[PDB]
Structure formats: C-alpha cells, structure tokens
Write an enzyme that holds these catalytic residues in place. Sequence first.
Site, PDB file in Angstrom:
ATOM      1  N   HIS A   3      31.735  36.501 -34.723  1.00  0.00           N
ATOM      2  CA  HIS A   3      31.217  36.541 -36.101  1.00  0.00           C
ATOM      3  C   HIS A   3      29.806  37.136 -36.155  1.00  0.00           C
ATOM      4  CE1 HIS A   3      34.288  34.700 -38.519  1.00  0.00           C
ATOM      5  NE2 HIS A   3      34.440  33.772 -37.603  1.00  0.00           N
ATOM      6  N   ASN A  25      41.443  28.139 -44.674  1.00  0.00           N
ATOM      7  CA  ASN A  25      40.394  27.271 -44.123  1.00  0.00           C
ATOM      8  C   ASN A  25      39.736  26.470 -45.266  1.00  0.00           C
ATOM      9  OD1 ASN A  25      40.711  27.827 -41.299  1.00  0.00           O
ATOM     10  ND2 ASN A  25      39.150  29.490 -41.375  1.00  0.00           N
ATOM     11  N   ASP A  85      65.052  36.574 -55.317  1.00  0.00           N
ATOM     12  CA  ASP A  85      64.189  35.476 -54.954  1.00  0.00           C
ATOM     13  C   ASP A  85      63.203  35.199 -56.103  1.00  0.00           C
ATOM     14  OD1 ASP A  85      63.247  33.422 -53.409  1.00  0.00           O
ATOM     15  OD2 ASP A  85      61.851  34.688 -52.221  1.00  0.00           O
ATOM     16  N   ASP A 138      44.381  32.369 -31.597  1.00  0.00           N
ATOM     17  CA  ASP A 138      44.788  32.136 -32.950  1.00  0.00           C
ATOM     18  C   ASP A 138      44.802  33.410 -33.821  1.00  0.00           C
ATOM     19  OD1 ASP A 138      41.989  32.214 -32.981  1.00  0.00           O
ATOM     20  OD2 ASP A 138      41.876  30.419 -34.258  1.00  0.00           O
ATOM     21  N   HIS A 139      43.876  34.324 -33.564  1.00  0.00           N
ATOM     22  CA  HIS A 139      43.720  35.564 -34.340  1.00  0.00           C
ATOM     23  C   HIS A 139      42.679  36.381 -33.631  1.00  0.00           C
ATOM     24  CE1 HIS A 139      39.944  34.021 -35.547  1.00  0.00           C
ATOM     25  NE2 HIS A 139      40.542  32.936 -35.984  1.00  0.00           N
ATOM     26  N   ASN A 147      62.213  32.334 -57.268  1.00  0.00           N
ATOM     27  CA  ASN A 147      61.312  31.186 -57.053  1.00  0.00           C
ATOM     28  C   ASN A 147      60.431  31.379 -55.816  1.00  0.00           C
ATOM     29  OD1 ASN A 147      63.348  30.842 -55.126  1.00  0.00           O
ATOM     30  ND2 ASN A 147      63.691  28.729 -55.630  1.00  0.00           N
ATOM     31  N   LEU A 188      64.112  32.454 -49.726  1.00  0.00           N
ATOM     32  CA  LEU A 188      65.485  32.125 -49.553  1.00  0.00           C
ATOM     33  C   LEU A 188      66.344  32.646 -50.700  1.00  0.00           C
ATOM     34  CD1 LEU A 188      64.874  28.346 -48.577  1.00  0.00           C
ATOM     35  CD2 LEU A 188      65.088  30.336 -47.032  1.00  0.00           C
ATOM     36  N   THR A 240      41.653  30.440 -38.673  1.00  0.00           N
ATOM     37  CA  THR A 240      41.799  29.475 -37.611  1.00  0.00           C
ATOM     38  C   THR A 240      42.841  28.383 -37.838  1.00  0.00           C
ATOM     39  OG1 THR A 240      39.558  29.908 -36.906  1.00  0.00           O
ATOM     40  CG2 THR A 240      40.553  27.935 -36.110  1.00  0.00           C
TER      41      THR A 240
END
Length: 805
Positions: free
Chosen positions: A265, A180, A683, A308-309, A685, A689, A159
């Site tokens: 749920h 969460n 990459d 949201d999902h 790190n 990027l 969420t």
Amino acid sequence: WTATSGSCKGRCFELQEVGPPDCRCDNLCKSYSSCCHDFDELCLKTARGWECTKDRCGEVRNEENACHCSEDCLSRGDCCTNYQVVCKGESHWVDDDCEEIKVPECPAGFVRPPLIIFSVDGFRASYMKKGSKVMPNIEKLRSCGTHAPYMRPVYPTKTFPNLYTLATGLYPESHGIVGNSMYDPVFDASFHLRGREKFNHRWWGGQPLWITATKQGVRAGTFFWSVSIPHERRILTILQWLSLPDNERPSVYAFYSEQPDFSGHKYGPFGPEMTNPLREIDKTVGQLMDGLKQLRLHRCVNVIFVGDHGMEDVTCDRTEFLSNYLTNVDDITLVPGTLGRIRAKSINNSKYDPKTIIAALTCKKPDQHFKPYMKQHLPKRLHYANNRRIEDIHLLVDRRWHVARKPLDVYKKCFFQGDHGFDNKVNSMQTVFVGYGPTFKYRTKVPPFENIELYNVMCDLLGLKPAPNNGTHGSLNHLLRTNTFRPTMPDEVSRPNYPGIMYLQSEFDLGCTCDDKVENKLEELNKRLHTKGSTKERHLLYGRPAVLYRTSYDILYHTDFESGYSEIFLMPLWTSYTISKQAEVSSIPEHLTNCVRPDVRVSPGFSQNCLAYKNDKQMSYGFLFPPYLSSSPEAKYDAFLVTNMVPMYPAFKRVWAYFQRVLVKKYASERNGVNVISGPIFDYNYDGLRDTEDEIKQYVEGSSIPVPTHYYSIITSCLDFTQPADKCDGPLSVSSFILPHRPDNDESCNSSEDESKWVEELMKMHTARVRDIEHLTGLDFYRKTSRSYSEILTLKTYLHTYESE
Ligand SMILES: *[C@@H]1O[C@H](CO)[C@@H](O[C@@H]2O[C@H](CO)[C@@H](O[C@@H]3O[C@H](CO[C@H]4O[C@H](CO)[C@@H](O)[C@H](O[C@H]5O[C@H](CO)[C@@H](O)[C@H](O)[C@@H]5O[C@H]5O[C@H](CO)[C@@H](O)[C@H](O)[C@@H]5O)[C@@H]4O)[C@@H](O)[C@H](O[C@H]4O[C@H](CO)[C@@H](O)[C@H](O)[C@@H]4O[C@H]4O[C@H](CO)[C@@H](O)[C@H](O)[C@@H]4O)[C@@H]3O)[C@H](O)[C@H]2NC(C)=O)[C@H](O)[C@H]1NC(C)=O
Ligand SMILES: Cn1c(COc2cc(Cl)c(C#N)cc2-c2cc(OC3CC3)ccc2F)n[nH]c1=O
Ligand SMILES: [Ca+2]
Ligand SMILES: [Ca+2]
Ligand code: NA
Ligand code: NA
Ligand SMILES: [Zn+2]
C-alpha cells in the site's frame, strides 16, 4: 466487562475459548481486550529473541526465554526453529535437495497428514518469479511441490472477502462478506475493519473450514492472529501445538501474514522497499519448515502457500470525483476506493432516484476511469449481486484508479502508492497458490484456477465432507497425488421428445410470412434424413446437454444445427452447431429478410408468433443458429424456423448480429473450426440460478414469450489446433460468454462507432465459465466425450480472461 485477574499459567494459546467475564488466553484475547493480566509475561515472551546461537547450545532451561536451546527442548516441543541446525550439525530445510514425498512419513500417533495454510496478504502472483532470488524457501516449495502460475481471487479483490471465500468455498454474495466495509439494512448495522462489530457472528455466513472440521471430529488450530503477536510467535505456537498428545493435537492450522500488503500500500507493488518484506516472509517460511524438520514432520504435513489478492499501482492523483458528475452529491453515501457502491444518504428522501444517478455517471467524460452499473448488470462472472449488503448502484473502477465522493475525502483522510479491489480478472490482482506435501503432486505445474475451489480440496486433504459451496468438486483433482474425489455426472431429470411432422401449415396463425413456396426423390430423402439427425454427429460433438430440472422439451434436428426446444419458454434452451475452418459466410437474401416459417414438428400453441413482435414497439427478434452460416441456400430456410427465433432488443441485435456474422467465422479460422452452443438465460432475481416460469418479469408485449436477461454461447475446439474441432482426439479448448440482453448499449461508450470497435470488447467483459452457464440454465454440458470427468470439470471452470501474460 472482563475480570482480567484470572491467570494464563499453563493456558498459553489455549484452543477452546473461555466465557466472559472470565479472562482469555487464546490468540484472539488481544482483539477483544480480554487477555488475563499475565498474558504478555507468560504467552508473549521475547527474551533472547528467536534464534539459538552456539553459546546457548546445551544451556540450562530458562523458562523466561522466547524459545529454547537446552537439551530437553525437543521433548518439550519449544526449541528455537534453528536449534538442530545451530546445535546438532543439521541442515536448514531449504538447503536439502528436494526428494519426492511418495507417501506420508509421519510419527506414530498421527491419524492423517496435518494441513497448514500459510496465507499471505497482498501477495501478487508475479512476485513468485520477480522475487524468486530473495525467496529461496518459497521457491523450493514452489519448484518441488504443485503450483499454479497464478490463482484468481474473488471480486471484490479485498482481504476479508477473499480470506473468507478461501475458508468457505463461497462467493462473497453468499458468505455475506461483500467488502471490507458494509451496511446491512435489515440489521441497520455497519461492518468496519477497525473495531468490534466485525466479530459479531451474523456477518459471517456459510460454514468455514474450522467449523467443518470441528463438526466432523477434526480439531482445528486458530485461523485469526491478533496483529500484535509477532510472526515468530505464531510459528512457535503452531509447532508447539503439533507436539501435543494425539487426542489434543489439531489437524488443521493457519498462519497469516499482513505482509506484503502493508508495505505494498505504501510503496506500490514493485517499490524498491518491497524486497525486504518478501525476504522477511521467506524467512518465516524457513522457520516453519526448519521447525517441521526438527519435529520429523517435514515429509508428513501438507502445506498450502496462498494469497488473498494482488496489488496494483494507485496514487491520490488518479482519483475520479463524483462531485464532477452529480449536482446532488450530498444526497448519496459512497463506499469509495477501487470499487464504488452508492446508496441514498437518507431513506426519507423520496426525491432520490437511481436512474438519474446512473445516467449522470454514464460516459460523461471521454477518458472516464469508472463505469456505473445497476448490480444486476455487472458481468455475471463476478457473482456480485444477490445480497442485501451489496448496494444497487455499483461502480467498476479501472485498474490504477480510485473513485471518491468529493476531493476533501482524499486529502482529509498523498500517502499511498498501491491498492487492490478491482475486477478479479485484472492481472495485477492475481495471487498465488503452492501446495507441498505427501498428498500434493511432485514438481507439477497446474493451470490457473479460482480460489473458490480450494475449500473442497482442503476438505479432501483432511477427510472431511465439504459443506455446500461454489467450488466444483473434482475440478482440482489434478493437483493431488491421492485423496481425489470421484464424482459422478448428475442424472438427467427430463428426457426429450423427438417430434416428427405433426402439423399442417394452415394450422398456424402466427402472423408470420416467408417467400418460400418453391420446390425430387434424390434430395427429398436427403432432407428427411437431416430432420431425423443424420448430421447430428457433426453438430453435437459432446453429446446433448442434460436437462437437470422437470420440464417439457423437444429435440429438433436440422442440416446445420440441433436444438433442445422448450415448450414452456417457447424457444430453445440450447442450440448446437459446428463451423469448420473452411465454412463460408453468406448474407440473408433479400426475399428472406422478414421470413419466419412455422415448424411443422411443433404445435401452434407451443410456438412464438410474429404479431407479438409487430405489436411490441420495443422488442425485435434474432435467431440462435445464424442464417449467415447456412451450409447451402436450401439449408438456409431452416434457420428461419419460428423454433430458432428469440426475442432481442434492436440495440442488442447489433451485438448479436456482429457476433454471428463476423466473430464466429473468425474464431473458426483461428481455432480450426468451432462448435457453438448458444441459448437464452433468465435470471430476473440475479441469484446466478435458472429462473422458474413464475419468476419471469417481462414478456414480449401481449404474449407468453418470456424475455431473456442474457444470451450465452459456449465455443469449443481442439486444444491441439492442428486437429479440426470435429475430429479432435485429445483435450478441448473453450471460451464462453453471458451477454446481458439490454435495450441500450449505454455500457459501451463507443457504441455509435462500427461494431468492429466495441462489440468484441463488450464480449470480453462478459466472458464466462461453462459452469456459470450451467447454474443459470440447469443444463449439464460435455456429457459424451472421450475425456476423464475430472478433466471435463476443469474445462467447465475455465475462464478465458483476455489479459496478456
Ligand atoms: C453458491 O453456493 C451456495 C451454497 O450452496 C448457494 O447458496 C444456497 O442457495 C440456495 C438457493 O438460493 C439456498 O437454499 C435456500 O435455503 C433456505 C434456508 O437457508 C438458511 O440455512 C442455510 C443452511 O444452514 C444457511 O446457509 C442460510 O444462510 C444465508 O442467510 C444468512 C443471512 O440471513 C447469511 O448468514 C448467509 O450469508 C446466507 O445468505 C445468503 O443466502 C441467502 C438465501 O438462503 C440469500 O438470501 C442471501 O442474499 C445470501 O446470498 C439460511 O440461513 C430455504 O428456506 C430456502 O427455501 C425456499 O425456497 C424453496 C424452493 O424449493 C421452497 O421450497 C420454499 O418454499 C422456501 O420458500 C419460502 O421462503 C421464501 C423466501 O423467503 C418465500 O418467498 C416463499 O414463499 C416460502 O415461504 C432455500 O432452500 C441456500 O440457503 C444457499 N446457501 C448459502 C450458504 O448461501 C448458491 O446458490 C451458490 N451460487 C451459485 C451461483 O451457484
Ligand atoms: C485477516 N487476519 C487473519 C487471517 O484470517 C484468516 C486466514 C485464513 Cl488462512 C483463512 C482461511 N482459509 C481465514 C481467515 C479468517 C479468520 C476469521 O476469524 C474471525 C474472528 C474474525 C474471519 C475470517 C477469515 F477469513 N488473522 N488476523 C487478521 O487480521
Ligand atoms: Ca488482503
Ligand atoms: Ca434466478
Ligand atoms: Na417490434
Ligand atoms: Na453507448
Ligand atoms: Zn490491502
């Protein structure tokens, strides 16, 4: 402390938050235990419910009522949402035919169409079709506006990470809400759904839409609703706010529903008990739209219906227990459930060791329903690593399963039948997008897209400049009638060198050998033309990629492929080639098995050397343009140039060689030719990027040859596959990957089998967007097509998911 004896008289759902100890009347006061003494009485009226009835029509205004059916209610902005319908003979919004909204039709005083975000928790994408008979308001929004068949959430599919991603345009690793539940080791503080620490502002990074609006002079309604405020009251509060005077009225609003998640749920995503919550949400939508119609705002406001999902079937009996794998289970802390995150219980324990935990959790049971990863080895598409709140050890849990530390954790906490949080490409986790309003398109379906893109669009809908974010601004322009954002391609920073033949063979001392001393003006002019770029239109279909940082590199042409060769990293940044449907696969001949050839266009000092690979007992090498796909025996020699070689662990070579020998041809056959761009990624790190030279942690032993962390390929063809990849008149089709360059195949539990049983499976797990590769390389692809730039931005954000429908 709160001094709760101030009063909310005339302040109900005030927008500005007043300061402690003075008591609050805003829709958050409940969550802080700070409301004034009379907040319930004044601000949460319930008397007579939420609907007008014939007997109330005309009534004498009674200020105790939850909403009003008196003649003055329209001017007051506080009628029940069905007032005009019950009392003035009007139709419900849902019963009106839809009619294109070509221009905003807004009341005088309105500077811009307002935006209302109607967010629904746990609203799985398939509910739009499967629940359509019981959701007629939502179905009208969907059918009449702009919709996607689904919207991809971010990982983890929980969420708060997703709602805050919606608000900010940022991956969780960048906004800071990485689950969460969280532990931040710098603050030594924990974030929980229950309780108060979650309101502390140090959790919440980036810049959410409400702050973006406020800073640019656009007023915002509240986004967070205290759970105890009923839905009907949330809607009436929004509608009341819409009736404020022009100088006070917000331009952006949010509504939130805890449903259908709450019930999902308990009952599973398709439990028979799920019908009612879907009915109830649709009713709420109908109240909003009826209320907007009453205010003459139903052809003025832009509405976003967004989840949201999704929600998956999950029960207590499908739990894996770390106590069945680890001896040391009391020395760890697990964040459990639909993902796992592990760290040391005690930072005083120097006997704690991640390598042994990982090994104890790796391929230990034949049907094992989770896979452990150091976070930097998770699929790059998840963008789930660059935050100190994400623990180094992660468990990706199979859909329909949980992971827990010990059994006692599951029965001392079966209750539930649904959950979410899984990998964001899983179909059950997908959610919904509908946009309806003057600024959205009419009766338009758009392809699925990622929720990280919406911030930009919401900013466009309100005339705001978005804060820096992970959306690709312009990629959703096809959703919009107007307010499109018209980006320009980034400028190239480094221009290439085009070297000719500058070095004699004997200048090289690379320790390489090749059985190639074997010999004509017809075909000599011809090979000269290939080294000058005469086949480059065939192999470089969308222009050369632009280099967006300062570096030194050469373009190298060949019969079968073109490359951009980095003098700094001693290998190609990119290699481009086209394989037609009719291409033939050949072997590497016996005499060329260990052939590496100096490239006479490129100095010894800017070349790899074979001695390094001989000395490095762990490292071997591969080739970017595959020798297996040479157009001719003579062209094959090009593929053995030292400038086409890259460092590869032997275990990774199994993957790579299968991709190049079998899969490329398979894709050309299925897609009617493919254009392939392959290359390394560094990459170290794990920030998503491109690394600079001074960030590289590993070299081929004794050399300056840097070792990639990943290898990518971008595989492009014609969307209309009746046209060959190299003669495509219309839209493109792409799939890409970013494969981790690992010294073992421990990720693949079936890797002792033939590559036909496990390689493609690995590659699907590591599917990527072209944009992901752009971030990781500082390259800009598709610079020269006949397509619109917005369309190309959409293409660059496409993810090939390999899920069924
Ligand atoms: C997705 O989109 C986002 C947003 O565009 C991209 O994120 C940006 O990436 C940039 C590069 O990684 C980064 O730029 C740096 O900003 C530093 C100042 O940043 C602060 O201010 C901004 C703006 O208001 C703010 O948003 C930041 O908030 C972060 O931190 C707090 C917690 O402290 C959180 O509330 C918040 O969630 C956020 O955390 C995230 O970002 C940080 C990195 O900033 C991560 O560490 C976290 O894990 C988390 O992911 C900041 O408060 C600035 O100081 C940096 O400059 C250094 O590097 C340059 C290179 O040119 C160099 O010139 C300087 O020398 C300087 O180095 C010095 O410090 C070094 C480090 O200590 C030291 O080693 C050196 O020796 C030097 O002394 C840098 O410019 C930008 O902040 C973020 N923004 C956000 C919002 O995350 C992201 O890349 C995109 N992702 C993809 C995959 O594309
Ligand atoms: C989950 N939830 C909500 C709805 O929250 C949001 C709804 C949307 Cl549509 C968007 C967007 N875009 C953002 C939020 C949101 C609000 C927040 O407010 C700070 C005090 C914590 C923090 C993070 C968020 F992401 N209300 N009540 C409740 O329990
Ligand atoms: Ca949710
Ligand atoms: Ca990096
Ligand atoms: Na070696
Ligand atoms: Na294995
Ligand atoms: Zn939930």
